[PDB]
Short mmCIF file of C-alpha atoms and ligand atoms in Angstrom, two decimals:
data_model
loop_
_atom_site.label_atom_id
_atom_site.label_comp_id
_atom_site.label_asym_id
_atom_site.label_seq_id
_atom_site.Cartn_x
_atom_site.Cartn_y
_atom_site.Cartn_z
CA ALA A 12 -24.18 2.52 10.74
CA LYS A 13 -25.85 4.39 7.82
CA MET A 15 -28.68 5.49 1.69
CA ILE A 16 -32.31 5.95 0.56
CA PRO A 17 -32.66 7.17 -3.10
CA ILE A 18 -34.87 10.14 -4.06
CA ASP A 19 -34.05 10.84 -7.73
CA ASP A 20 -31.22 11.76 -10.13
CA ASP A 21 -29.72 14.70 -8.26
CA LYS A 22 -30.04 13.61 -4.64
CA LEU A 23 -30.58 10.91 -2.07
CA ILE A 24 -31.02 10.55 1.69
CA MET A 25 -28.21 9.58 4.00
CA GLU A 26 -29.54 8.29 7.30
CA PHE A 27 -27.31 7.68 10.32
CA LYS A 28 -28.34 4.67 12.44
CA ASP A 29 -27.65 3.74 16.06
CA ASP A 30 -25.85 0.54 14.94
CA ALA A 31 -22.08 0.22 15.11
CA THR A 32 -19.78 -2.55 13.81
CA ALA A 33 -16.07 -3.17 14.15
CA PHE A 34 -13.46 -5.71 13.18
CA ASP A 35 -14.90 -6.64 9.79
CA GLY A 36 -18.38 -6.81 11.37
CA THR A 37 -17.46 -9.45 13.94
CA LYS A 38 -18.27 -6.96 16.72
CA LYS A 39 -21.76 -5.41 16.82
CA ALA A 40 -23.66 -3.22 19.26
CA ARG A 41 -26.37 -0.59 19.29
CA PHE A 42 -25.98 2.88 20.81
CA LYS A 43 -29.12 5.00 21.32
CA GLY A 44 -28.53 8.53 20.09
CA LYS A 45 -25.34 7.77 18.08
CA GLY A 46 -27.13 8.18 14.75
CA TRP A 47 -28.21 11.66 15.88
CA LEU A 48 -24.79 12.74 17.11
CA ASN A 49 -22.94 11.56 13.95
CA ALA A 50 -25.52 13.22 11.65
CA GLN A 51 -25.18 16.53 13.51
CA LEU A 52 -21.41 16.35 13.64
CA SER A 53 -21.22 15.50 9.89
CA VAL A 54 -23.36 18.59 9.08
CA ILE A 55 -21.10 20.83 11.21
CA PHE A 56 -17.96 19.42 9.54
CA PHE A 57 -19.37 19.60 5.98
CA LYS A 58 -20.47 23.20 6.55
CA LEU A 59 -17.05 24.21 7.93
CA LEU A 60 -15.35 22.60 4.94
CA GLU A 61 -17.76 24.20 2.42
CA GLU A 62 -16.93 27.66 3.85
CA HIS A 63 -13.27 26.83 3.24
CA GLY A 64 -14.04 25.98 -0.39
CA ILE A 65 -14.25 22.14 -0.20
CA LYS A 66 -16.91 20.68 -2.54
CA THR A 67 -18.94 18.19 -0.46
CA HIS A 68 -22.15 16.30 -1.15
CA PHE A 69 -24.01 17.99 1.70
CA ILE A 70 -27.25 19.59 0.47
CA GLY A 71 -29.48 19.89 3.55
CA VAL A 72 -31.05 18.31 6.62
CA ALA A 73 -34.23 16.23 6.40
CA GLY A 74 -34.86 16.03 10.18
CA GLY A 75 -34.11 13.13 12.53
CA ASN A 76 -30.80 11.46 11.64
CA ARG A 77 -31.21 12.19 7.89
CA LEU A 78 -29.22 14.38 5.48
CA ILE A 79 -30.08 15.34 1.93
CA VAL A 80 -26.93 14.63 -0.10
CA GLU A 81 -25.90 14.94 -3.76
CA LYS A 82 -25.82 11.72 -5.83
CA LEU A 83 -22.36 10.88 -7.22
CA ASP A 84 -20.42 8.29 -9.15
CA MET A 85 -18.65 7.00 -6.05
CA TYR A 86 -14.97 6.09 -6.20
CA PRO A 87 -14.43 2.67 -4.60
CA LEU A 88 -11.87 4.14 -2.18
CA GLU A 89 -11.46 4.97 1.44
CA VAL A 90 -8.91 7.73 1.82
CA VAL A 91 -7.12 7.81 5.15
CA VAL A 92 -5.19 10.83 6.49
CA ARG A 93 -2.91 10.19 9.52
CA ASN A 94 -1.25 12.84 11.79
CA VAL A 95 -0.55 10.63 14.82
CA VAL A 96 0.39 6.94 14.86
CA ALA A 97 -2.61 4.76 15.89
CA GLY A 98 -4.54 1.69 14.65
CA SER A 99 -3.31 -0.18 11.56
CA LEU A 100 -0.34 2.18 11.09
CA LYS A 101 1.40 0.49 14.04
CA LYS A 102 1.65 -2.65 11.82
CA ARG A 103 3.06 -0.78 8.83
CA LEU A 104 5.68 1.41 10.58
CA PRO A 105 7.74 0.47 13.69
CA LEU A 106 6.47 3.49 15.61
CA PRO A 107 4.57 3.72 18.88
CA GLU A 108 0.99 4.77 19.42
CA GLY A 109 0.97 8.54 19.94
CA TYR A 110 3.98 9.16 17.75
CA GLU A 111 3.55 12.54 16.03
CA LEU A 112 4.29 12.16 12.29
CA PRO A 113 6.67 14.76 10.76
CA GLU A 114 4.05 15.22 8.02
CA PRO A 115 0.57 13.79 7.25
CA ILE A 116 0.34 10.26 5.78
CA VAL A 117 -2.32 9.56 3.12
CA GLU A 118 -3.33 5.91 2.55
CA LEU A 119 -5.65 4.59 -0.14
CA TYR A 120 -7.88 1.57 0.51
CA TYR A 121 -9.86 -0.24 -2.13
CA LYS A 122 -13.52 -0.55 -0.91
CA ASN A 123 -14.02 -4.28 -1.46
CA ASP A 124 -15.74 -6.55 1.07
CA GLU A 125 -14.46 -9.69 -0.66
CA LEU A 126 -10.85 -8.56 -0.12
CA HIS A 127 -11.37 -6.84 3.28
CA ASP A 128 -10.54 -3.34 2.02
CA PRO A 129 -6.83 -3.79 1.17
CA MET A 130 -4.43 -0.85 0.87
CA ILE A 131 -3.49 0.15 -2.63
CA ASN A 132 -1.20 2.59 -4.40
CA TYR A 133 -1.62 4.79 -7.56
CA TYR A 134 -0.93 1.88 -9.88
CA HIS A 135 -3.68 -0.32 -8.41
CA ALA A 136 -6.03 2.68 -8.63
CA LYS A 137 -5.19 3.09 -12.33
CA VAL A 138 -6.10 -0.57 -12.95
CA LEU A 139 -9.34 0.19 -11.09
CA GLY A 140 -10.08 3.05 -13.58
CA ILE A 141 -8.80 6.02 -11.57
CA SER A 142 -6.26 8.19 -13.33
CA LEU A 143 -3.17 9.57 -11.61
CA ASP A 144 -4.60 13.10 -12.04
CA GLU A 145 -7.80 12.08 -10.19
CA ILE A 146 -5.74 10.47 -7.38
CA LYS A 147 -3.64 13.65 -7.07
CA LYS A 148 -6.78 15.83 -6.82
CA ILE A 149 -8.24 13.36 -4.27
CA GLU A 150 -5.13 13.41 -2.02
CA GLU A 151 -4.85 17.23 -2.40
CA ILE A 152 -8.39 17.65 -1.15
CA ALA A 153 -7.88 15.10 1.71
CA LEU A 154 -4.75 17.01 2.79
CA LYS A 155 -6.61 20.36 2.74
CA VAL A 156 -9.54 18.85 4.63
CA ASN A 157 -6.94 17.65 7.18
CA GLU A 158 -5.47 21.15 7.77
CA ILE A 159 -8.91 22.74 8.20
CA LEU A 160 -10.19 20.01 10.57
CA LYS A 161 -7.02 19.68 12.68
CA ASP A 162 -6.72 23.47 13.17
CA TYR A 163 -10.38 23.86 14.04
CA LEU A 164 -10.29 20.99 16.55
CA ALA A 165 -6.88 21.84 18.09
CA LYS A 166 -8.41 25.23 18.97
CA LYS A 167 -10.94 23.18 20.98
CA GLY A 168 -8.59 20.86 22.89
CA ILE A 169 -8.95 17.97 20.41
CA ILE A 170 -6.11 16.29 18.49
CA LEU A 171 -7.07 14.98 15.07
CA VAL A 172 -5.15 11.70 15.08
CA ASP A 173 -6.39 10.30 11.73
CA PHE A 174 -9.62 9.97 9.75
CA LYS A 175 -11.30 8.36 6.75
CA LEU A 176 -12.83 10.12 3.73
CA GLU A 177 -14.74 8.95 0.68
CA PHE A 178 -15.31 10.76 -2.60
CA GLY A 179 -17.32 10.71 -5.77
CA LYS A 180 -17.56 12.53 -9.08
CA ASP A 181 -20.47 14.88 -9.87
CA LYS A 182 -22.03 15.33 -13.28
CA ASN A 183 -19.55 18.08 -14.18
CA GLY A 184 -16.72 15.63 -13.47
CA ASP A 185 -15.71 17.51 -10.30
CA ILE A 186 -14.37 15.53 -7.36
CA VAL A 187 -16.82 15.70 -4.46
CA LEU A 188 -16.32 14.79 -0.78
CA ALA A 189 -18.95 12.24 0.29
CA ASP A 190 -19.91 9.72 3.00
CA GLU A 191 -19.72 11.14 6.56
CA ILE A 192 -17.32 12.90 8.97
CA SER A 193 -17.88 11.86 12.57
CA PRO A 194 -16.44 10.20 15.68
CA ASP A 195 -17.19 6.93 13.80
CA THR A 196 -14.78 7.84 10.97
CA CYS A 197 -12.09 9.86 12.81
CA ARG A 198 -9.74 9.42 15.72
CA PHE A 199 -10.24 12.28 18.21
CA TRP A 200 -8.05 12.59 21.31
CA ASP A 201 -8.36 15.04 24.14
CA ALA A 202 -5.35 17.41 23.86
CA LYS A 203 -4.56 17.13 27.58
CA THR A 204 -5.25 13.52 28.65
CA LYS A 205 -4.78 11.86 25.21
CA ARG A 206 -8.08 9.96 25.80
CA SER A 207 -10.20 8.65 22.92
CA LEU A 208 -13.47 10.40 22.02
CA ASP A 209 -14.34 8.27 19.01
CA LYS A 210 -15.15 4.75 17.78
CA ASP A 211 -12.05 3.36 19.58
CA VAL A 212 -14.14 3.58 22.78
CA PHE A 213 -16.41 0.93 21.24
CA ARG A 214 -13.62 -0.90 19.36
CA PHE A 215 -11.39 -1.54 22.37
CA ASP A 216 -13.93 -1.30 25.21
CA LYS A 217 -12.58 1.89 26.72
CA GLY A 218 -15.68 3.14 28.47
CA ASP A 219 -19.02 4.63 27.47
CA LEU A 220 -19.29 5.37 23.74
CA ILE A 221 -22.29 7.70 24.04
CA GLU A 222 -20.59 9.79 26.78
CA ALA A 223 -17.43 10.21 24.67
CA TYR A 224 -19.54 11.27 21.64
CA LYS A 225 -21.57 13.60 23.86
CA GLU A 226 -18.34 15.28 25.08
CA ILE A 227 -17.19 15.83 21.48
CA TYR A 228 -20.57 17.31 20.56
CA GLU A 229 -20.59 19.61 23.62
CA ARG A 230 -16.94 20.60 23.12
CA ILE A 231 -17.47 21.39 19.44
CA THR A 232 -20.90 23.07 19.47
CA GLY A 233 -20.62 24.80 22.87
CA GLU A 234 -23.94 23.33 24.04
CA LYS A 235 -24.90 19.85 25.36
CA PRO A 236 -26.84 17.44 23.02
CA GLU A 237 -30.59 18.10 22.92
CA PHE A 238 -31.57 14.91 21.01
CA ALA B 12 19.38 -18.19 0.17
CA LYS B 13 22.36 -15.76 0.10
CA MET B 15 26.95 -11.16 2.26
CA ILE B 16 30.62 -11.44 3.27
CA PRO B 17 32.40 -8.03 3.70
CA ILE B 18 35.75 -7.25 2.04
CA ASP B 19 36.30 -3.50 2.63
CA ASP B 20 34.81 -0.04 1.97
CA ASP B 21 34.13 -0.33 -1.75
CA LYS B 22 33.01 -3.94 -2.09
CA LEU B 23 31.74 -7.13 -0.56
CA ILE B 24 30.97 -10.72 -1.57
CA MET B 25 27.49 -11.92 -2.37
CA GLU B 26 27.27 -15.69 -2.14
CA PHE B 27 24.25 -17.65 -3.38
CA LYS B 28 23.42 -20.72 -1.26
CA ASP B 29 21.47 -23.90 -2.03
CA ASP B 30 18.95 -23.07 0.75
CA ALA B 31 15.46 -21.84 -0.06
CA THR B 32 12.70 -20.54 2.26
CA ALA B 33 9.11 -19.57 1.68
CA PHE B 34 6.08 -18.37 3.59
CA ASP B 35 7.90 -16.19 6.11
CA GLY B 36 10.48 -18.98 6.59
CA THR B 37 7.95 -21.60 7.68
CA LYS B 38 8.88 -23.70 4.63
CA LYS B 39 12.53 -24.73 4.16
CA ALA B 40 14.39 -27.03 1.80
CA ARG B 41 17.80 -27.41 0.20
CA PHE B 42 18.39 -27.67 -3.55
CA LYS B 43 21.83 -28.78 -4.77
CA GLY B 44 23.02 -26.51 -7.57
CA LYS B 45 20.45 -23.71 -6.98
CA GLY B 46 23.09 -21.36 -5.58
CA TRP B 47 25.09 -21.85 -8.79
CA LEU B 48 22.16 -21.31 -11.14
CA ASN B 49 20.93 -18.13 -9.38
CA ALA B 50 24.47 -16.65 -9.26
CA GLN B 51 24.95 -17.28 -12.99
CA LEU B 52 21.52 -15.98 -13.90
CA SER B 53 22.04 -12.82 -11.76
CA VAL B 54 25.34 -12.12 -13.59
CA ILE B 55 23.65 -12.52 -17.00
CA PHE B 56 20.79 -10.20 -15.96
CA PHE B 57 23.06 -7.56 -14.36
CA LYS B 58 25.27 -7.53 -17.47
CA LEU B 59 22.27 -7.15 -19.81
CA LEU B 60 20.96 -4.28 -17.69
CA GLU B 61 24.38 -2.57 -17.48
CA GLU B 62 24.61 -2.58 -21.31
CA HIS B 63 21.23 -0.84 -21.33
CA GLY B 64 22.56 1.84 -18.97
CA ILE B 65 21.21 0.56 -15.60
CA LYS B 66 23.61 1.19 -12.69
CA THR B 67 23.87 -2.09 -10.75
CA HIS B 68 26.15 -3.23 -7.95
CA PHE B 69 27.68 -6.01 -10.04
CA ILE B 70 31.49 -5.76 -10.10
CA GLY B 71 32.74 -9.26 -10.95
CA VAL B 72 32.68 -13.01 -10.32
CA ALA B 73 34.73 -14.60 -7.54
CA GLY B 74 34.18 -18.22 -8.65
CA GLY B 75 31.76 -20.79 -7.20
CA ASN B 76 28.45 -19.16 -6.27
CA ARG B 77 30.10 -15.82 -5.36
CA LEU B 78 29.85 -12.34 -6.90
CA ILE B 79 31.94 -9.28 -6.15
CA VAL B 80 29.44 -6.46 -5.59
CA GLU B 81 29.64 -2.75 -4.72
CA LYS B 82 28.88 -1.75 -1.11
CA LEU B 83 25.88 0.59 -0.77
CA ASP B 84 23.68 2.36 1.74
CA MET B 85 20.78 -0.03 1.20
CA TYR B 86 17.23 1.29 1.07
CA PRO B 87 14.99 -0.83 3.32
CA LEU B 88 12.65 -1.58 0.39
CA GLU B 89 11.64 -4.39 -1.85
CA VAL B 90 10.35 -3.00 -5.12
CA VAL B 91 7.92 -5.22 -6.95
CA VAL B 92 7.02 -4.85 -10.65
CA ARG B 93 3.94 -6.81 -11.88
CA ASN B 94 2.90 -7.46 -15.54
CA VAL B 95 0.61 -10.45 -14.95
CA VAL B 96 -1.67 -11.10 -11.96
CA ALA B 97 -0.15 -13.76 -9.63
CA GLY B 98 0.70 -14.24 -5.92
CA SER B 99 -0.27 -11.53 -3.41
CA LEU B 100 -1.85 -9.33 -6.11
CA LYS B 101 -4.84 -11.71 -6.23
CA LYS B 102 -5.68 -10.49 -2.67
CA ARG B 103 -5.39 -6.81 -3.55
CA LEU B 104 -7.32 -6.75 -6.87
CA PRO B 105 -10.34 -8.95 -7.79
CA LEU B 106 -8.56 -10.32 -10.85
CA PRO B 107 -7.69 -13.89 -11.80
CA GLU B 108 -4.26 -15.47 -11.97
CA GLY B 109 -2.93 -14.93 -15.49
CA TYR B 110 -4.75 -11.67 -16.00
CA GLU B 111 -2.59 -9.42 -18.21
CA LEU B 112 -2.38 -5.92 -16.63
CA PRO B 113 -3.06 -2.96 -18.98
CA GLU B 114 0.17 -1.44 -17.62
CA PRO B 115 2.89 -2.49 -15.11
CA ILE B 116 2.12 -2.23 -11.38
CA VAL B 117 4.91 -1.10 -9.01
CA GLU B 118 4.54 -1.96 -5.30
CA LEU B 119 6.80 -0.84 -2.46
CA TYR B 120 7.41 -3.09 0.55
CA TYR B 121 9.17 -2.01 3.70
CA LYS B 122 11.94 -4.59 4.49
CA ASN B 123 11.09 -5.29 8.13
CA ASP B 124 11.04 -8.81 9.61
CA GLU B 125 9.16 -7.62 12.71
CA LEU B 126 6.27 -6.39 10.53
CA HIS B 127 6.48 -9.13 7.84
CA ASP B 128 7.45 -6.77 5.01
CA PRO B 129 4.23 -4.69 4.74
CA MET B 130 3.34 -2.72 1.61
CA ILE B 131 3.85 1.01 1.83
CA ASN B 132 3.25 4.11 -0.26
CA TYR B 133 5.33 7.31 -0.87
CA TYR B 134 4.22 8.85 2.40
CA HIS B 135 5.39 5.90 4.53
CA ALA B 136 8.68 5.99 2.60
CA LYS B 137 9.10 9.69 3.43
CA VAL B 138 8.65 8.90 7.15
CA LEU B 139 11.30 6.20 6.64
CA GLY B 140 13.73 8.88 5.28
CA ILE B 141 13.21 8.40 1.53
CA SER B 142 12.30 11.51 -0.39
CA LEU B 143 9.64 11.57 -3.10
CA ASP B 144 12.39 12.33 -5.67
CA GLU B 145 14.31 9.19 -4.61
CA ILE B 146 11.12 7.07 -4.83
CA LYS B 147 10.42 8.47 -8.33
CA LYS B 148 13.96 7.61 -9.50
CA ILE B 149 13.60 4.13 -7.91
CA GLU B 150 10.27 3.37 -9.66
CA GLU B 151 11.61 4.83 -12.96
CA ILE B 152 14.55 2.47 -12.86
CA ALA B 153 12.34 -0.53 -11.85
CA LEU B 154 10.03 0.24 -14.80
CA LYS B 155 12.99 0.45 -17.23
CA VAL B 156 14.47 -2.75 -15.84
CA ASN B 157 11.03 -4.31 -16.47
CA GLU B 158 10.93 -3.33 -20.17
CA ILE B 159 14.46 -4.62 -20.82
CA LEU B 160 13.89 -7.94 -18.97
CA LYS B 161 10.40 -8.66 -20.35
CA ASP B 162 11.48 -7.96 -23.97
CA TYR B 163 14.62 -10.05 -23.66
CA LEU B 164 12.74 -12.99 -22.12
CA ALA B 165 9.65 -12.80 -24.39
CA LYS B 166 12.08 -13.26 -27.30
CA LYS B 167 12.96 -16.56 -25.59
CA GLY B 168 9.48 -17.95 -24.92
CA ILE B 169 9.35 -16.68 -21.31
CA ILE B 170 6.71 -14.33 -19.85
CA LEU B 171 7.97 -12.04 -17.12
CA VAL B 172 5.00 -12.18 -14.75
CA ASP B 173 6.46 -10.08 -11.88
CA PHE B 174 9.72 -9.67 -9.96
CA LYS B 175 11.37 -8.11 -6.93
CA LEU B 176 14.22 -5.56 -6.90
CA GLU B 177 16.27 -3.93 -4.17
CA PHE B 178 18.37 -0.77 -4.35
CA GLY B 179 20.98 1.23 -2.54
CA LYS B 180 22.79 4.54 -2.80
CA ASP B 181 26.48 4.73 -3.79
CA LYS B 182 28.95 7.26 -2.44
CA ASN B 183 28.08 9.75 -5.19
CA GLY B 184 24.44 9.56 -4.07
CA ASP B 185 23.42 7.67 -7.23
CA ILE B 186 20.68 5.07 -6.98
CA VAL B 187 22.12 1.60 -7.58
CA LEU B 188 20.33 -1.70 -8.34
CA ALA B 189 21.37 -4.34 -5.79
CA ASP B 190 20.50 -7.78 -4.35
CA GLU B 191 19.92 -10.47 -7.03
CA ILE B 192 17.85 -11.19 -10.16
CA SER B 193 16.96 -14.86 -10.48
CA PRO B 194 14.20 -17.49 -10.61
CA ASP B 195 14.11 -17.00 -6.79
CA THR B 196 13.10 -13.32 -7.15
CA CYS B 197 11.01 -13.36 -10.37
CA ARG B 198 7.99 -15.13 -11.75
CA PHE B 199 8.87 -16.75 -15.09
CA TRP B 200 6.22 -18.56 -17.16
CA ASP B 201 6.68 -20.52 -20.33
CA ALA B 202 5.03 -18.47 -23.12
CA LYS B 203 3.22 -21.52 -24.52
CA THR B 204 2.13 -23.70 -21.57
CA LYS B 205 2.00 -20.93 -18.89
CA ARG B 206 4.01 -23.23 -16.56
CA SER B 207 6.15 -21.86 -13.72
CA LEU B 208 9.96 -21.87 -14.03
CA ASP B 209 10.71 -20.12 -10.76
CA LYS B 210 10.39 -20.29 -6.96
CA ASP B 211 6.63 -21.05 -7.27
CA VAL B 212 7.69 -24.63 -8.13
CA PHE B 213 9.08 -24.85 -4.58
CA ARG B 214 6.42 -22.60 -2.99
CA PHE B 215 3.39 -24.56 -4.20
CA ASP B 216 4.96 -27.99 -4.82
CA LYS B 217 4.60 -27.94 -8.58
CA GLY B 218 7.34 -30.36 -9.53
CA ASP B 219 11.13 -30.37 -9.54
CA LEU B 220 12.66 -27.00 -8.68
CA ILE B 221 16.13 -27.80 -10.04
CA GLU B 222 14.71 -29.00 -13.40
CA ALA B 223 12.65 -25.80 -13.82
CA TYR B 224 15.74 -23.67 -13.01
CA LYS B 225 17.84 -25.79 -15.37
CA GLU B 226 15.31 -25.16 -18.20
CA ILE B 227 15.49 -21.39 -17.61
CA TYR B 228 19.29 -21.50 -17.65
CA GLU B 229 19.37 -23.59 -20.85
CA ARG B 230 16.67 -21.47 -22.52
CA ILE B 231 18.45 -18.22 -21.65
CA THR B 232 22.10 -19.12 -22.21
CA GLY B 233 21.62 -21.55 -25.13
CA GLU B 234 23.65 -24.27 -23.39
CA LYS B 235 22.79 -26.73 -20.57
CA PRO B 236 24.20 -26.06 -17.02
CA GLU B 237 27.79 -27.26 -16.54
CA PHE B 238 27.93 -26.81 -12.73
N1 LIG C 1 -16.07 3.87 10.53
C1 LIG C 1 -14.98 3.45 9.83
N2 LIG C 1 -13.81 4.14 9.97
C2 LIG C 1 -12.70 3.76 9.27
C3 LIG C 1 -12.77 2.60 8.37
N3 LIG C 1 -11.54 2.44 7.83
C4 LIG C 1 -10.75 3.43 8.33
N4 LIG C 1 -11.44 4.21 9.20
C5 LIG C 1 -10.93 5.38 9.96
O1 LIG C 1 -9.67 5.78 9.41
C6 LIG C 1 -8.67 5.86 10.43
C7 LIG C 1 -7.57 4.81 10.24
O2 LIG C 1 -8.06 3.48 10.43
P1 LIG C 1 -7.12 2.21 10.68
O3 LIG C 1 -6.43 1.94 9.36
O4 LIG C 1 -6.18 2.62 11.79
O5 LIG C 1 -8.10 1.15 11.10
C8 LIG C 1 -9.41 5.70 11.75
O6 LIG C 1 -9.79 7.00 12.21
C9 LIG C 1 -10.68 4.96 11.41
O7 LIG C 1 -11.71 5.34 12.33
C10 LIG C 1 -14.08 1.91 8.28
O8 LIG C 1 -14.21 0.91 7.53
N5 LIG C 1 -15.10 2.37 9.01
N1 LIG C 2 12.82 -14.50 -3.13
C1 LIG C 2 11.89 -13.56 -2.79
N2 LIG C 2 11.08 -13.05 -3.77
C2 LIG C 2 10.14 -12.11 -3.46
C3 LIG C 2 9.99 -11.65 -2.07
N3 LIG C 2 9.01 -10.73 -2.06
C4 LIG C 2 8.56 -10.61 -3.33
N4 LIG C 2 9.23 -11.43 -4.17
C5 LIG C 2 9.02 -11.59 -5.63
O1 LIG C 2 8.22 -10.51 -6.12
C6 LIG C 2 7.09 -11.00 -6.85
C7 LIG C 2 5.77 -10.69 -6.15
O2 LIG C 2 5.64 -11.40 -4.91
P1 LIG C 2 4.24 -11.60 -4.15
O3 LIG C 2 3.89 -10.24 -3.59
O4 LIG C 2 3.28 -12.10 -5.19
O5 LIG C 2 4.59 -12.63 -3.11
C8 LIG C 2 7.33 -12.50 -7.02
O6 LIG C 2 8.04 -12.70 -8.24
C9 LIG C 2 8.25 -12.89 -5.89
O7 LIG C 2 9.06 -14.00 -6.30
C10 LIG C 2 10.90 -12.26 -1.07
O8 LIG C 2 10.84 -11.91 0.13
N5 LIG C 2 11.79 -13.18 -1.49
#
């Protein structure tokens, strides 16, 4: 769905029209999805930067391309969950739609060989990530959560869960990386509880592009120009 | 492999000759195993009690039966790992036998429906277990680890990993429960690195009873009387 090096300080992140699911056993191509996800990442990164979150966003380079800061990437995917959906149904005997009493943070080791298994703080330590780093990472993820869920709730969108990735900059500061989009979040309409995210593609729920268009219109206030 | 109520304060824990593996898809019966595991649990509980670990062990009731304290059981299995073996090979790209730089503690939610999935502190909280409780539980597991690994290393046995369970007594103190035996630990001979534990049954490595007998002889100093 997405890195083209420039130099020491920066690289290009390009969003593609490809989508994969289920460990890459399901593939399809959606015209315009690159564009939507690039635009929506920019909007989210900017909102978070205003709230004092250090992100890798530097600028736009036209098309579906962002200029981003180069980082020593942690091999983690950091998942924040507000509402029970997806893999959480297999870890806790709770139904889809269940509202958690407080946010859940899950750590996944980015490892294709092992299919991205969940880890805790001890596994992370063996992977070279101190407890203090983990604490800072979860603290940021949790703050990101509050900002994004408030912003979206005030637009008729429930932030069900989402995935973040992080890296360290040259000062040793922890920096939010990768993307933030309907590909990497669960977004539900506040009224109907309908999916406006990758679950439309994952579980064949309708038209992916239309659901992404609705999110873009309902966030930005104007329909997608492309 | 094992509860017969007495009253409010206590119950009977009986160790049986049955063994199961792989989610109960593998079954077999081993004459004498109940007896060995009961005796070895007693020895371990006593050693830990001397070192100031609160356990549910009250007394022996002859045969393969222990008198134990009744508790509000946490629905957890708490795993401590010193050497890479078993499921850890699927979570970290490390070989069997790899010596961890420090102990790993893993939490599993005891749930047959969900096949005992791993959890973190956030899942535990949703299950009703405060962060403070979790911290006390891991602190005890880690202390138990030091005591058991020292004691066994001074007998030519490597403590690879093991599983603990816990409950709360009426004072709200956290109490070590279930069993401690070759069923619930990985034990390797310090020289040959051979298994003297349930892995003999799990992966058809030889004679289970003989491996358990060796552990009993090499711990107690005398061969099993039965
Ligand atoms: N695009 C993408 N999203 C992910 C991945 N892993 C987790 N997520 C996001 O994180 C949340 C939880 O995922 P789950 O564990 O339920 O599959 C969902 O919003 C999901 O979209 C991934 O590998 N790719
Ligand atoms: N008897 C028993 N032992 C377990 C269970 N779950 C974990 N253990 C113990 O905890 C350690 C780690 O298990 P693993 O996750 O590698 O299967 C091993 O020593 C194993 O014997 C269980 O359900 N039953």
